[PDB]
Amino acid sequence: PSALTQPPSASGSLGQSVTISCTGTSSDVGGYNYVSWYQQHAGKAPKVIIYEVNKRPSGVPDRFSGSKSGNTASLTVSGLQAEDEADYYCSSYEGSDNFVFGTGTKVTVLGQPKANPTVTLFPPSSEELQANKATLVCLISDFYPGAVTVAWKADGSPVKAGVETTKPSKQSNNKYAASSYLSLTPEQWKSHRSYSCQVTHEGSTVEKTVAPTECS
Amino acid sequence: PSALTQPPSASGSLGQSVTISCTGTSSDVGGYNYVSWYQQHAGKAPKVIIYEVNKRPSGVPDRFSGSKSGNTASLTVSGLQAEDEADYYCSSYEGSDNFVFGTGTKVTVLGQPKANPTVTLFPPSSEELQANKATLVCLISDFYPGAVTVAWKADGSPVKAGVETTKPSKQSNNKYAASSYLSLTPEQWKSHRSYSCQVTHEGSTVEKTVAPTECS
Amino acid sequence: XXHX
Numbered sequence A, B: 001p002s003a004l005t006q007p008p009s010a011s012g013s014l015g016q017s018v019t020i021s022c023t024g025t026s027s028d029v030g031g032y033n034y035v036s037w038y039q040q041h042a043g044k045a046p047k048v049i050i051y052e053v054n055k056r057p058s059g060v061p062d063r064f065s066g067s068k069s070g071n072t073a074s075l076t077v078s079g080l081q082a083e084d085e086a087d088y089y090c091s092s093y094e095g096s097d098n099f100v101f102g103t104g105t106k107v108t109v110l111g112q113p114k115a116n117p118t119v120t121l122f123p124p125s126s127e128e129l130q131a132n133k134a135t136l137v138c139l140i141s142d143f144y145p146g147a148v149t150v151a152w153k154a155d156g157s158p159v160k161a162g163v164e165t166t167k168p169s170k171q172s173n174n175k176y177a178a179s180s181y182l183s184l185t186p187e188q189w190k191s192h193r194s195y196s197c198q199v200t201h202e203g204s205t206v207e208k209t210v211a212p213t214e215c216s
Numbered sequence C: 001x002x003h004x
Helices: A126-130 A186-190 B126-131 B186-190
Strands: A009-012 A018-024 A035-040 A047-050 A064-069 A072-077 A087-095 A098-101 A106-109 A118-122 A134-143 A149-154 A163-165 A176-184 A195-200 A205-210 B009-013 B017-023 B035-040 B047-050 B063-069 B072-078 B086-093 B099-101 B105-110 B118-122 B134-143 B149-154 B163-170 B176-184 B195-201 B204-210
Touching: A009 A018, A018 A087, A035 A064, A047 A064, A072 A087, A098 B047, A118 A195, A118 A205, A118 B134, A126 A134, A134 A149, A134 A186, A134 A195, A134 B118, A134 B134, A134 B176, A149 A163, A149 A176, A176 A186, A176 A195, A176 B134, A176 B163, A176 B176, B009 B017, B017 B035, B017 B086, B017 B105, B035 B063, B035 B072, B047 B063, B072 B086, B118 B195, B118 B204, B126 B134, B134 B149, B134 B186, B134 B195, B149 B163, B149 B176, B176 B186, B176 B195
Parallel strands: A009 A106, B009 B105
Antiparallel strands: A018 A072, A035 A047, A035 A087, A064 A072, A087 A098, A118 A134, A134 A176, A149 A195, A163 A176, A195 A205, B017 B072, B035 B047, B035 B086, B063 B072, B086 B099, B086 B105, B118 B134, B134 B176, B149 B195, B163 B176, B195 B204
């Protein structure tokens, strides 16, 4: 299941070395060792680049490296070349049915200066609530590189249901903009002290909270 | 010079079948019995739907089946549900601990109905205000197909500047989601009667218009 | 990736 976590966005400049970790959940534990790295590109398809935790296949340059401790696997791109820009996924083989993948990690050879998101949380508008509706919105803007992670919370209890997270588009200023949204009943909204919206972006996490009011 | 060969796209229709053929060589596909398939949704993580010719994951739906027919692997997908539209990958062992991937297929399902998008215009939050900034998010959602236009009016006359529109993403219901913001100052905000957002879908217009009113 |  959605069970191995990776950084939304990992980046660097040509020659720098990025690390990617695969902080898997409760994971496949006694001694679990079929962690495998994939590199996917711009509409081409996945190419394994590391397997069996640290063993790279023939073709891979030792620029790449595999690792693991307890709950976090690793991938080091030890001397960033341009062509290294792409998605990267991990995999762990719990048991035969269930091959568990990471969530991806976009490696970016930077280009422009770095940019952490402006989070902007909107409450259900009154007129909306007069419709007998409730939708909340998280505006994510002005970020670089283009890979964000949004989580939502009902009082700081994960809310998976009702959530849509747009994939990040590009603005006229060449930074990105994603938007996540909650659709709920006015009962739903009113019977919780606060809703949050949390977005990770390369070791920044911003969490906006919001509370229910009334007068409509 | 090789990887598994796949036909770049398949077309099916709600409930009928579709069979995606992955084709290898004596070395790999048909040589060993380790041919697998992946369902990979628009820029998301890949799911392993089949592992060993034909064996599904416990938790994989309807007609996800496989038929290794010589050097031809075929993924039969019947009971066509919108939710299927993805990019499908196949794989084969090929000795010395290496695995080859397919060129992928974009399986489009035909006959899925056209939705006119819900528009939800959001005034600047009290606090965004309390800071001095004031954006307004127009959320266009639940639409099919994924093409829309978004306009903004600074009451009557148009706003063609300050606008930043994230164009469509695939919701968990084979339906799109897109937004557009306008970054006002509270100045600008209050210096007008209304701000409208205008969403054209398939020759339908929807115009939502907000005035400084609200509760919260 | 599983076995092989």
